[PDB]
Amino acid sequence: CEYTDWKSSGALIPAIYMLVFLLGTTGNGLVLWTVFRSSREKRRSADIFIASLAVADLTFVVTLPLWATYTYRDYDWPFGTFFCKLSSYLIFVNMYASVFCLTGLSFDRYLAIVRPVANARLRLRVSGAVATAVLWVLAALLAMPVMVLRTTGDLENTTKVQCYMDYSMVATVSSEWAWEVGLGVSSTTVGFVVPFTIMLTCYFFIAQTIAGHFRKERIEGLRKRRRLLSIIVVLVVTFALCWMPYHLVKTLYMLGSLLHWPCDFDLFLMNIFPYCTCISYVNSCLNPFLYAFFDPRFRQACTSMLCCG
Amino acid sequence: CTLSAEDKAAVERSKMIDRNLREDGEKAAREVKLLLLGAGESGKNTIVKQMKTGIVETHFTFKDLHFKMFDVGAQRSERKKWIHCFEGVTAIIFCVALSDYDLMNRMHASMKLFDSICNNKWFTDTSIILFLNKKDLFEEKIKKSPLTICYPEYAGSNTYEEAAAYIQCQFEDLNKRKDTKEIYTHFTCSTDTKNVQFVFDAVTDVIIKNNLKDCGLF
Amino acid sequence: NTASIAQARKLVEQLKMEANIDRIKVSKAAADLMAYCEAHAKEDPLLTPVPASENPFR
Amino acid sequence: VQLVESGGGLVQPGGSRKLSCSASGFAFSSFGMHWVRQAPEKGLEWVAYISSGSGTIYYADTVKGRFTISRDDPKNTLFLQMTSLRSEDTAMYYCVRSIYYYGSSPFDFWGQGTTLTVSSSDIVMTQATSSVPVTPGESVSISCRSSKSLLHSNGNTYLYWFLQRPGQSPQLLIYRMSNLASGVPDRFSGSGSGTAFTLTISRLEAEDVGVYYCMQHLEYPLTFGAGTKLEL
Amino acid sequence: SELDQLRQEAEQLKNQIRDARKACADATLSQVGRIQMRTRRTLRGHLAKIYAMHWGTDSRLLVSASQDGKLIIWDSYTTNKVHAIPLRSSWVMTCAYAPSGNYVACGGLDNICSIYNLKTREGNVRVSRELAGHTGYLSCCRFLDDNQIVTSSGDTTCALWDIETGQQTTTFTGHTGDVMSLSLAPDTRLFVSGACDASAKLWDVREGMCRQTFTGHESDINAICFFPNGNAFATGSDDATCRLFDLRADQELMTYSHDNIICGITSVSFSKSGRLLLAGYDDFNCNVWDALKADRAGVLAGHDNRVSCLGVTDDGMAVATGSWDSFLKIWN
Ligand SMILES: CCC(CC)n1c(Cc2cccs2)nc2cc(C(=O)N[C@H](CC(=O)O)CC(C)C)ccc21
């Protein structure tokens, strides 16, 4: 049935990509600026993750104009092989580091809130810098197959250079399908399913703790109990809505390869996927407001620096 | 390089000093600091004895949480020149006797002290654990001496449950920053068993709430 | 009581001792204070900074 | 302040011994420790060093690989484990106390020593005079020269003077080139150029007759001059 | 009765003092370019607010005290810790380095001045004496020599202590408010003490007598330092003004203030020539004043909390500042 580019996607995807680039870099930029400019010894024990998350989100969107260009041109990649590999690797490492940073905040929050006098000696060993060092290394390695297999080439029926995962480098036999599937499944399991499960588990217990200790003085207790439970639901839901369609479409597309689905399913999944990608980028733009600027003292710190220098 | 054999050795000594300072700091970070304030001839001695001259320090351990209480009575000097030294205590324990109501009455003095601490700039985010002491004496006195002696507007029954609730409210409404601190109130006497569990639970709530701010949930 | 009378007397005796002071004129005192500062100005590194090679805190 | 050495006596070559050095009367864990050796007819030789906290260990290259230095702070004990002993290792072994900080005075306490009998680019210093005839009340000058300047960029000169009275372990007299050790009388003083040094005894007492040693403490290995004997 | 007769005599004497001083007012002091110091060394290690700092006499060592329960002896040139001394009482308000370098004084809300021996056979630092006897907090202590220390406290008195016997030998009374600070004359003969009476007193150390009373602050005096030649003092208070007093004229000589300073003064010190006056404030910084003109000469900025203490070395080479942000800094 061939491939149809809903056509209008050639304008919408590049435009969205440049928009998330501008919002993402501005938002993360202010967070890193505020985080590294204010007094260090007076800081809250959250800032290492806020900084790590802002770095992951900033890096995740900064190479995006290369893909906007590729998509604008009709899937015709200038720049060459060094950039398909560098850009794709950075997007993947940061896709993993951002999720792990969010997971790290949930875990740090769990240990700090749910049983604070029992877990004090655990946080000192696993929270903050230890967690930040590990998730960055873990993200760097998980994305490694992308730098290895992402290449450039030009198909006889296309005559345009396209960035893609080659696989033939590791599969010179029919087993190739297993590399396509094994990497997609591993990426989904580690990049979404496990982190999401952890974030949900941690927030569930945090939410029980918040409801349990905010039942007195039913003016202030209720305002805080409602504000806190409301943000917890938003943090969980926003994450899932933004990442779920990227992993769902990717998974369905792979299943249809082994399960011979109607061509209409494959074309619809291929045409929708670029939007799923645009949606995933939304967290890079919202995270600053969900985790850095949610806290009024951070908003005040950023505002005071902007009003002075 | 560039150091002499003796300077390298001096540096190694300095590094060991830093190691010990850090380890001692980590231990201190897990202790609960409580400031003990209250009216004269009140329950401060009752609370310390049940829980267990310059500043007096008392140590307690309960449910594996280690506590240190600092009694700043005796120090009859200007409070404004030193009270800031307690900025950072987890909580303030404040003692008022219920019986103060018919003894300027002692209860008026007790409310004035409470307000000076509660609304103090150095304690903006510090919670208060309030003990209303000698409830058994209060019941014996309230049945003869109504609260209208020190609280003329009171129009309830002259018995412990209504009068005691009234007194609690009179202290809890001295909190001018309900958005930053809570007042935990417990009614006690010379004989009790729950004052340590009460302080422990109030402290645990203070710790959780401080961690919500520290973690950015605020 | 008489304790307050004794305290009033202590104040009177202390003030009497302070009243009986041979005081220097300010013009002279101000001049001497200045003379100290000028005489030792060259000796003071926070006023007249030391060359880096002579600075222990370089 | 006391240090008591053990583990001496006769061992055959190729064998091994441990010296123990039990400490008391001081905050042992805060001090580094050194072993200093003296052959029966010779001067002093530095053997090994362990820092407080056991972070740093140095050995003379005459013993390195055969000797091991270790400490056990909870027992106030300093060990030296020697293997493959040679006749070259016959000596008195002294346990020596040393603490380093600005203004400290290292090597201010020596033990009495254990005698071990074994059957059959360094900075070096010269004590040109092996012996000086003296009388009580006389002014005595003891010289020492270094192959390298002992004056560092930090302004200090790393020269120590020690006195070994007959039948006794060495006593620290001076710890900075010109800075006199605690408990040592004003009779003793000293100075130098950074390569040439002098120990001065303004008036000699009979009790101060003995062998004076010059020690270098700028770099490891620590080294000593031969020693100058006063004869009274 | 006699009570009113004596109060009337006291008022008459107060006016005799006023007029004797007015009679000397034939001039004012008012009738350095810019000072730009930089941090050269940062001393890290305290885990709590620093309340006190004092330079030793070799201009290289410092002692500092904080609420983490320790004193630290620092090597100001290398930043190395030389000693760290556990305190029995964490509420330390003051400390002092003996001029001999042999001892360190320390105390606060325990109302005791403890004396620590830094030069022992054992290699550790031990308490040699606990100078108990004040009823209020110890606000300030300074050594005259190894056997004598001067203290001030919250019970409104100052005292001269005999360290070896642990006794007060002289008690200096007459302040009515808590006494906040001490400063010793260069020759040790006179003390000046500041208090919450918004006044300062000049004491004769050998007698217990108050020689002069200096008034003029609108609020509590938190800090006093002697002008280097011993004939003048600078004070700092909660009214956000520093004041220079003349000991021979028995008069205020000059004031140091600015429209934008509404914060208290926690510490004052002079440079060797006496030309610069430095003061620490609740604005988390230190202002450098031209002591003979009262112009601001410069600002030492860099603390994230109240500057609690200042000191200048004896050789005039450096200024140390300490604050509630748990750090010390050395400026030059
Ligand atoms: C590195 C470039 C970015 C896009 C800006 N990019 C990310 C990173 C991001 C994740 C979330 C936002 S960005 N992942 C990607 C996955 C694919 C891909 O595999 N396309 C399949 C090709 C085929 O198999 O025919 C077809 C779909 C239907 C599976 C393409 C680009 C991907």
mmCIF file of N, CA and C in Angstrom, chain B residues 2-14 16 19, chain D residues 51-52 55-56 99-101 106 152 154 158 160 176 217-218:
data_model
loop_
_atom_site.group_PDB
_atom_site.id
_atom_site.type_symbol
_atom_site.label_atom_id
_atom_site.label_comp_id
_atom_site.label_asym_id
_atom_site.label_seq_id
_atom_site.Cartn_x
_atom_site.Cartn_y
_atom_site.Cartn_z
ATOM 1 N N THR B 2 55.505 19.981 45.961
ATOM 2 C CA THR B 2 55.788 21.318 46.550
ATOM 3 C C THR B 2 55.724 21.374 48.086
ATOM 4 N N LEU B 3 55.212 20.331 48.717
ATOM 5 C CA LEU B 3 55.139 20.244 50.169
ATOM 6 C C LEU B 3 56.378 19.562 50.718
ATOM 7 N N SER B 4 56.833 19.955 51.911
ATOM 8 C CA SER B 4 57.964 19.281 52.537
ATOM 9 C C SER B 4 57.456 18.021 53.199
ATOM 10 N N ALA B 5 58.340 17.131 53.647
ATOM 11 C CA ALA B 5 57.853 15.911 54.292
ATOM 12 C C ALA B 5 56.921 16.208 55.471
ATOM 13 N N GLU B 6 57.188 17.288 56.200
ATOM 14 C CA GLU B 6 56.372 17.629 57.345
ATOM 15 C C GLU B 6 55.072 18.322 56.966
ATOM 16 N N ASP B 7 54.990 18.906 55.771
ATOM 17 C CA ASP B 7 53.769 19.582 55.399
ATOM 18 C C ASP B 7 52.835 18.539 54.878
ATOM 19 N N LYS B 8 53.378 17.509 54.247
ATOM 20 C CA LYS B 8 52.513 16.466 53.754
ATOM 21 C C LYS B 8 51.851 15.813 54.943
ATOM 22 N N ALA B 9 52.632 15.595 56.006
ATOM 23 C CA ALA B 9 52.114 15.010 57.223
ATOM 24 C C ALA B 9 51.085 15.921 57.898
ATOM 25 N N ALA B 10 51.316 17.238 57.882
ATOM 26 C CA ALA B 10 50.352 18.164 58.459
ATOM 27 C C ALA B 10 49.034 18.124 57.698
ATOM 28 N N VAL B 11 49.104 17.965 56.375
ATOM 29 C CA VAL B 11 47.915 17.866 55.546
ATOM 30 C C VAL B 11 47.156 16.593 55.852
ATOM 31 N N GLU B 12 47.858 15.473 56.004
ATOM 32 C CA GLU B 12 47.184 14.231 56.326
ATOM 33 C C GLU B 12 46.418 14.375 57.642
ATOM 34 N N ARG B 13 47.025 15.033 58.639
ATOM 35 C CA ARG B 13 46.346 15.270 59.902
ATOM 36 C C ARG B 13 45.083 16.086 59.707
ATOM 37 N N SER B 14 45.168 17.136 58.891
ATOM 38 C CA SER B 14 44.030 17.995 58.626
ATOM 39 C C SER B 14 42.904 17.194 57.998
ATOM 40 N N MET B 16 42.284 13.998 58.349
ATOM 41 C CA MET B 16 41.643 13.160 59.350
ATOM 42 C C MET B 16 40.738 13.974 60.256
ATOM 43 N N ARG B 19 37.566 14.292 58.388
ATOM 44 C CA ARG B 19 36.782 13.078 58.402
ATOM 45 C C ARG B 19 35.999 12.969 59.686
ATOM 46 N N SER D 51 52.311 6.638 59.408
ATOM 47 C CA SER D 51 51.592 7.822 59.828
ATOM 48 C C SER D 51 50.481 7.525 60.795
ATOM 49 N N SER D 52 49.993 8.567 61.453
ATOM 50 C CA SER D 52 48.849 8.370 62.295
ATOM 51 C C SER D 52 47.742 8.068 61.320
ATOM 52 N N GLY D 55 47.803 6.039 56.987
ATOM 53 C CA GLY D 55 47.670 6.450 55.599
ATOM 54 C C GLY D 55 48.967 6.369 54.811
ATOM 55 N N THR D 56 50.075 6.688 55.459
ATOM 56 C CA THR D 56 51.351 6.743 54.778
ATOM 57 C C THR D 56 52.401 5.878 55.419
ATOM 58 N N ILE D 99 54.659 13.702 65.915
ATOM 59 C CA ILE D 99 53.375 14.284 65.499
ATOM 60 C C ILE D 99 53.600 15.514 64.636
ATOM 61 N N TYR D 100 52.859 15.613 63.537
ATOM 62 C CA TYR D 100 53.059 16.719 62.615
ATOM 63 C C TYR D 100 51.886 17.666 62.425
ATOM 64 N N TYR D 101 52.127 18.921 62.751
ATOM 65 C CA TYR D 101 51.189 20.018 62.596
ATOM 66 C C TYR D 101 51.969 21.307 62.671
ATOM 67 N N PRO D 106 58.386 16.956 66.259
ATOM 68 C CA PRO D 106 58.527 15.543 65.916
ATOM 69 C C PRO D 106 59.761 14.918 66.541
ATOM 70 N N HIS D 152 63.456 24.919 53.014
ATOM 71 C CA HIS D 152 62.422 24.719 52.034
ATOM 72 C C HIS D 152 61.794 26.046 51.604
ATOM 73 N N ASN D 154 58.852 26.921 52.139
ATOM 74 C CA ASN D 154 57.926 27.318 53.181
ATOM 75 C C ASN D 154 58.633 28.103 54.297
ATOM 76 N N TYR D 158 64.795 22.103 57.901
ATOM 77 C CA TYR D 158 64.501 20.813 58.491
ATOM 78 C C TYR D 158 65.659 20.075 59.096
ATOM 79 N N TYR D 160 67.205 18.629 62.751
ATOM 80 C CA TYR D 160 67.006 18.185 64.108
ATOM 81 C C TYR D 160 68.306 17.800 64.793
ATOM 82 N N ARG D 176 63.529 22.462 65.036
ATOM 83 C CA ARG D 176 63.569 23.215 63.772
ATOM 84 C C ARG D 176 65.013 23.557 63.816
ATOM 85 N N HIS D 217 65.284 16.123 58.015
ATOM 86 C CA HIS D 217 63.882 15.741 57.889
ATOM 87 C C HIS D 217 63.143 16.522 56.809
ATOM 88 N N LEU D 218 63.722 16.606 55.634
ATOM 89 C CA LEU D 218 63.130 17.349 54.547
ATOM 90 C C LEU D 218 62.417 16.383 53.625
#
